[PDB]
Short mmCIF file of C-alpha atoms and ligand atoms in Angstrom, two decimals:
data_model
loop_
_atom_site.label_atom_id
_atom_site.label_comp_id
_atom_site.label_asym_id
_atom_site.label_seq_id
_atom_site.Cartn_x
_atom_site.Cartn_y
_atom_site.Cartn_z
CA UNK A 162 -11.35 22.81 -36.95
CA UNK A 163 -7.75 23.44 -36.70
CA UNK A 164 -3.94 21.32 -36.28
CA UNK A 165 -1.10 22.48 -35.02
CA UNK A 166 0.95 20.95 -37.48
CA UNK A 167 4.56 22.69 -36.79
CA UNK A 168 6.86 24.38 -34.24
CA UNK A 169 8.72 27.55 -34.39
CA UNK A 170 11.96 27.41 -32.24
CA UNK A 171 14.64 30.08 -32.43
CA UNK A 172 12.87 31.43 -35.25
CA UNK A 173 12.90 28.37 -37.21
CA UNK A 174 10.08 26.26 -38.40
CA UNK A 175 10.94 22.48 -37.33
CA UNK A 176 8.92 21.56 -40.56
CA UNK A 177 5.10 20.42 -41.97
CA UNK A 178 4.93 17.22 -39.01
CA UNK A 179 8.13 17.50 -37.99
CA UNK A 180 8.46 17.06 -34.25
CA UNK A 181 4.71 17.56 -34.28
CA UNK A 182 2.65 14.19 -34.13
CA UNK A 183 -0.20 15.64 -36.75
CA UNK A 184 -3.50 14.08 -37.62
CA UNK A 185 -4.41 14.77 -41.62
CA UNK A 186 -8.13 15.54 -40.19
CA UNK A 187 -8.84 18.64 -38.48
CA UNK A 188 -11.87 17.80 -36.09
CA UNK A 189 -11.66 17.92 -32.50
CA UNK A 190 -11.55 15.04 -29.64
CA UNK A 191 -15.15 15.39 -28.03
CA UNK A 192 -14.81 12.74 -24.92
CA UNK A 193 -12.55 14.29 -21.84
CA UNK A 194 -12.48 10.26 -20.68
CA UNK A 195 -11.01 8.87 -23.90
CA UNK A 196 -6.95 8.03 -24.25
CA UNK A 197 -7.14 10.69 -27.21
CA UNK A 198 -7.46 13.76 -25.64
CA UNK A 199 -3.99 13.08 -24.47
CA UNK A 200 -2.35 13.70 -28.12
CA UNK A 201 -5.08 13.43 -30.28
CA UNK A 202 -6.39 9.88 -31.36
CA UNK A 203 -9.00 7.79 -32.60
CA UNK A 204 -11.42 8.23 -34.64
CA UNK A 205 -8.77 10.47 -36.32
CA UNK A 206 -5.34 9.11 -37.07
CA UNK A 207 -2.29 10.82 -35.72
CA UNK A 208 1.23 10.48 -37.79
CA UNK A 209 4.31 9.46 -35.70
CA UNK A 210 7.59 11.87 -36.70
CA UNK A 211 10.95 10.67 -35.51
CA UNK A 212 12.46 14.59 -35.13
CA UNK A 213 13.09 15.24 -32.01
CA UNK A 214 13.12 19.62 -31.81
CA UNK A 215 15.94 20.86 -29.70
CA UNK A 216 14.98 24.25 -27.29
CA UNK A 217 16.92 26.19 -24.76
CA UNK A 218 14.92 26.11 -21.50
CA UNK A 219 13.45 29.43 -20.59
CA UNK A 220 12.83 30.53 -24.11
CA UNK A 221 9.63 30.10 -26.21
CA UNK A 222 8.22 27.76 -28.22
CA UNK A 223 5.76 28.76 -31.05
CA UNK A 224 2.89 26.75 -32.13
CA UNK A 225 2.11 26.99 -35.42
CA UNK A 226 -1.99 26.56 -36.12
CA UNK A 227 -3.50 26.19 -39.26
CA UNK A 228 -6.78 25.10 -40.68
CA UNK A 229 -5.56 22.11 -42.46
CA UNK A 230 -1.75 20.11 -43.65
CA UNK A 231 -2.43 21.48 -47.01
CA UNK A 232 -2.78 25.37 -45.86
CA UNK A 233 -0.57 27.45 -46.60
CA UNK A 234 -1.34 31.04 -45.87
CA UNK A 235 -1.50 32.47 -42.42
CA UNK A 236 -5.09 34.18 -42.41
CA UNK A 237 -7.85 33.88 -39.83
CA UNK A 238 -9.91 31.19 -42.49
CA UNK A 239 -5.99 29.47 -42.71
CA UNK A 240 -5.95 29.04 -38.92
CA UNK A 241 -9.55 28.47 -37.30
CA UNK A 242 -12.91 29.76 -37.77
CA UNK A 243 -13.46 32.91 -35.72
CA UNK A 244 -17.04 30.75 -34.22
CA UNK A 245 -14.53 28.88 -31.89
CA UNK A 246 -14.11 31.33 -29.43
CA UNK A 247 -11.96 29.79 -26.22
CA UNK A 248 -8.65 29.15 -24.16
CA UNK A 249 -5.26 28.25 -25.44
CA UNK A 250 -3.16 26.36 -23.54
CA UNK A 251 0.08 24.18 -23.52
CA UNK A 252 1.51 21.32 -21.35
CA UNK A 253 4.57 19.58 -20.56
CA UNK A 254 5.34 15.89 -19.91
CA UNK A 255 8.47 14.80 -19.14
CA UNK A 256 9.28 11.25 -20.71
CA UNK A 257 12.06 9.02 -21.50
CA UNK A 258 11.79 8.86 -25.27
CA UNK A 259 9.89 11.81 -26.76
CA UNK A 260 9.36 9.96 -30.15
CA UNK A 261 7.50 6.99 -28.11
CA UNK A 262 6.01 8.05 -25.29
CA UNK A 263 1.84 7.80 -26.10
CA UNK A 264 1.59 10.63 -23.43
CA UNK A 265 -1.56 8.61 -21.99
CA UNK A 266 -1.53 9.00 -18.08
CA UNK A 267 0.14 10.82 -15.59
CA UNK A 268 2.86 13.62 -15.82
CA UNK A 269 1.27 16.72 -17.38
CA UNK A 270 2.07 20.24 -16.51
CA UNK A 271 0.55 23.30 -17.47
CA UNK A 272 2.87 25.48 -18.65
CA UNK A 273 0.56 28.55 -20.51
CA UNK A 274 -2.73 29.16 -20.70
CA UNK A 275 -5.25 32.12 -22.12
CA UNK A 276 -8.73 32.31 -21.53
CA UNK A 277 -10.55 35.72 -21.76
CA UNK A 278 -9.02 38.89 -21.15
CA UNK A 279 -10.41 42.13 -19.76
CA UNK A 280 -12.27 43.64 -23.03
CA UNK A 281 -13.95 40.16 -23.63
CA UNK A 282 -11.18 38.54 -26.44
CA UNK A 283 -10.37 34.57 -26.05
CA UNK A 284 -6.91 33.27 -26.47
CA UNK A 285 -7.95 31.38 -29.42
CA UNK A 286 -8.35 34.65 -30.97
CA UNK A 287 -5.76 35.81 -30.60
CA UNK A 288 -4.35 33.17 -32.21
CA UNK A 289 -6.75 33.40 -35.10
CA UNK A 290 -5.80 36.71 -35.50
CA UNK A 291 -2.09 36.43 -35.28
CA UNK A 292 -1.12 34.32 -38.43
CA UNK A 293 -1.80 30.86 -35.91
CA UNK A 294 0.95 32.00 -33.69
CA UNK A 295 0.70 30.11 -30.12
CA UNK A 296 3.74 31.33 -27.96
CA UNK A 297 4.77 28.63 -25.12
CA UNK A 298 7.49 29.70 -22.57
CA UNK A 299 9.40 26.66 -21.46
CA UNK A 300 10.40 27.03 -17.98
CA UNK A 301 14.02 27.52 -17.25
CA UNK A 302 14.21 25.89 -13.83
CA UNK A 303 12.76 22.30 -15.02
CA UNK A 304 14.99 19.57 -15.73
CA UNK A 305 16.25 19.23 -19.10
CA UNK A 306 15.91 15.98 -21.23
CA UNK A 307 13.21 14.53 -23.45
CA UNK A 308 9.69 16.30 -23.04
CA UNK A 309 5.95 16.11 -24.41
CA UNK A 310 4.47 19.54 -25.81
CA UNK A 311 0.78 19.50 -25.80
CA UNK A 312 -0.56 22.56 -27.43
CA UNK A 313 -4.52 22.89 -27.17
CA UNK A 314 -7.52 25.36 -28.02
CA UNK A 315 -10.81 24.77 -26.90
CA UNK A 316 -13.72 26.00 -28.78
CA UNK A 317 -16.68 26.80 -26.99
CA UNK A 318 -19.14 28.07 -29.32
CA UNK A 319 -20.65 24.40 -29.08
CA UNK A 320 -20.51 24.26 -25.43
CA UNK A 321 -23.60 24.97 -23.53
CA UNK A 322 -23.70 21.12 -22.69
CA UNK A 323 -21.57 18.41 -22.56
CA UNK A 324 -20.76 16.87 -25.08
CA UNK A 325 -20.08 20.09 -26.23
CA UNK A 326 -16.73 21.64 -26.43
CA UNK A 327 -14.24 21.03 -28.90
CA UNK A 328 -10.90 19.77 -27.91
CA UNK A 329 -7.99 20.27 -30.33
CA UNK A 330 -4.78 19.48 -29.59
CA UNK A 331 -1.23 17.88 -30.90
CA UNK A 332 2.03 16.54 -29.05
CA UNK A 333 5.34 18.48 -30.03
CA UNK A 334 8.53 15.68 -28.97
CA UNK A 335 10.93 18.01 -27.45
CA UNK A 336 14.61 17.96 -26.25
CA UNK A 337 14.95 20.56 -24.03
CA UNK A 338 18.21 21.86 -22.83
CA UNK A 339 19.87 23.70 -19.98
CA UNK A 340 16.98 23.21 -17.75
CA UNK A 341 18.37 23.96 -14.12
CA UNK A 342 16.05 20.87 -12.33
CA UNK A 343 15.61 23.00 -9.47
CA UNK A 344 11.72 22.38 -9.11
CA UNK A 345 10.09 19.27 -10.02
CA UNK A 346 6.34 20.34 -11.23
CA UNK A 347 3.17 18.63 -9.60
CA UNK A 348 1.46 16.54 -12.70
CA UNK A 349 -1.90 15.86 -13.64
CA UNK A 350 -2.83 13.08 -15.95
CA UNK A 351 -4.63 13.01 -19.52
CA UNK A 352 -7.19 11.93 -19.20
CA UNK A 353 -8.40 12.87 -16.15
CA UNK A 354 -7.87 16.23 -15.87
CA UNK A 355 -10.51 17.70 -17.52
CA UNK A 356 -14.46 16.98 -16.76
CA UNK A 357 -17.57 17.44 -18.70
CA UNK A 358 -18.98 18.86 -15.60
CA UNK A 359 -15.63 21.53 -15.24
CA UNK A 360 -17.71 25.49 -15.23
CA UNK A 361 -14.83 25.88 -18.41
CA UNK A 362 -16.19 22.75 -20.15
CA UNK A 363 -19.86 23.22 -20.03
CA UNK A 364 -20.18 26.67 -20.89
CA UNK A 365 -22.78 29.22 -22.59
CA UNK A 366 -20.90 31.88 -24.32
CA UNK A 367 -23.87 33.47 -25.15
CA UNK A 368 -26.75 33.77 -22.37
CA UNK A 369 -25.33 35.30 -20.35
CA UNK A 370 -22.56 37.09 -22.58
CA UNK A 371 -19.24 35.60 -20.27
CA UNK A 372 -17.40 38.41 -18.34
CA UNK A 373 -15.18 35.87 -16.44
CA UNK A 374 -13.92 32.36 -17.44
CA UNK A 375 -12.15 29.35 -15.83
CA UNK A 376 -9.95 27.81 -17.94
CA UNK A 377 -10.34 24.05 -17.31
CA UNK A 378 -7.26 22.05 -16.02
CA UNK A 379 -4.45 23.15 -13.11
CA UNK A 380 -2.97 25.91 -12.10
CA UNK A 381 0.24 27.22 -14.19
CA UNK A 382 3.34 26.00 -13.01
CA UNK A 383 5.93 29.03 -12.54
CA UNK A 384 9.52 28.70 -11.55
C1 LIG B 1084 6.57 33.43 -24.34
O1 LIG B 1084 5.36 32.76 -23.93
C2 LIG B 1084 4.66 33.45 -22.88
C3 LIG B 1084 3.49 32.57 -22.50
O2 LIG B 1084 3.93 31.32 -21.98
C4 LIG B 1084 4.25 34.84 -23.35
O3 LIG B 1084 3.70 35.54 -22.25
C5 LIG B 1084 2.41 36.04 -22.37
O4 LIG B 1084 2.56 36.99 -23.32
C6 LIG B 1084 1.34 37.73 -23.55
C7 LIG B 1084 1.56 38.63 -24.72
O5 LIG B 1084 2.50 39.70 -24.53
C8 LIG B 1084 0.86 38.39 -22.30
O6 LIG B 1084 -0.49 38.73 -22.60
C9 LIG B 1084 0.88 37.40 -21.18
O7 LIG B 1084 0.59 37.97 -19.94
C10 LIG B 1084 2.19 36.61 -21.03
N1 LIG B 1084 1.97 35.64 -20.02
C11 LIG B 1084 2.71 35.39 -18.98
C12 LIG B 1084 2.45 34.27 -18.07
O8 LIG B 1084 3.67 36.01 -18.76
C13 LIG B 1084 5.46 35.62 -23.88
O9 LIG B 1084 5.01 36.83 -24.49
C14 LIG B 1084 6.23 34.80 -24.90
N2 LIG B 1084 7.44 35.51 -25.31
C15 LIG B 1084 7.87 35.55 -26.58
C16 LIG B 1084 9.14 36.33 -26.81
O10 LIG B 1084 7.27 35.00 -27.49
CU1 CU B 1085 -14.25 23.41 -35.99
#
């Protein structure tokens, strides 16, 4: 149970749900197939936010993580309980209005991900463990304009079958500037690209203990 309810650009907090489309509960989408694992949804209820956060392409966003819209500190309890061991990972969708596109359907690039390392830690550990602190390159050589963040961790420790996993995730509305447009990314859509049956998705964490894992999804686009 966790939201990422702000981003850090520049070294600047954008603000509590500002630029961030934030639900006020923290549980996860469960359903791959449903229109909310897009940008969070139904049965929760996400806020709309008309900021629109400016970046410089090739630098980093920072996702901001935290337990619930009322925390305040920047402990492991204040970000996500250390149970929900799994990936991090964050998207791109290039729209024409970043403050109304649902982000349903096609257009999604992967743009970072982190599963588990060599000495057995999970990116949402990491995370856990570094006061909620999710750090997103934007590429340089995309084209610049109005984009869709979507910042997810996956916890696992619920995963041996499907329904299982834990899906949480939030939409960042983006302006991104100075891209060069030199490659146009392949897309994948949401939903769609993720499967119950996907060896990242139905998962035992425990028997055996994991040594290797597949973080669900495409490949990371690189420039
Ligand atoms: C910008 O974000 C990228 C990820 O998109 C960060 O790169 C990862 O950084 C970690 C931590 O040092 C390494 O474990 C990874 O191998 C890096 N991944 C890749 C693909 O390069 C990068 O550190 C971030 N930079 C800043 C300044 O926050
Ligand atoms: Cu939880």
């Amino acid at each position: 149970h966790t939201i990422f309810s702000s981003l850090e650009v520049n070294g600047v907090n954008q603000g509590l749900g500002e630029g961030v489309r934030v639900p006020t509960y923290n549980g996860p989408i469960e359903d791959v197939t449903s229109a909310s694992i897009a940008c969070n949804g139904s049965p929760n209820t996400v806020a709309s936010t008309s900021k629109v956060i400016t970046v410089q392409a090739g630098t980093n966003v920072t996702a901001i993580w935290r337990y619930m819209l009322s925390t305040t500190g920047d402990s492991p309890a204040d970000v996500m309980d250390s149970s929900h061991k799994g990936p991090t990972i964050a998207y791109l969708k290039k729209v024409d209005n970043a403050a109304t596109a649902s982000g349903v359907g096609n257009g999604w690039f992967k743009i970072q991900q982190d599963g588990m390392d060599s000495s057995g830690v999970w990116g949402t550990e990491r995370v856990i463990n570094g006061k909620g602190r999710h750090s997103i390159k934007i590429p340089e050589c995309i084209a610049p304009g109005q984009y869709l963040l979507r910042a997810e961790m996956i916890a696992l420790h619920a995963a041996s079958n499907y329904p299982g996993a834990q899906f949480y995730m939030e939409c960042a509305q983006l302006n991104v500037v100075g891209g060069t447009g030199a490659k146009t990314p392949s897309t994948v859509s949401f939903p769609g690209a993720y499967s119950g049956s996907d060896p990242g998705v139905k998962i035992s964490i425990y028997w055996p203990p994991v040594t290797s894992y597949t973080v669900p999804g495409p490949s990371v686009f690189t420039c």
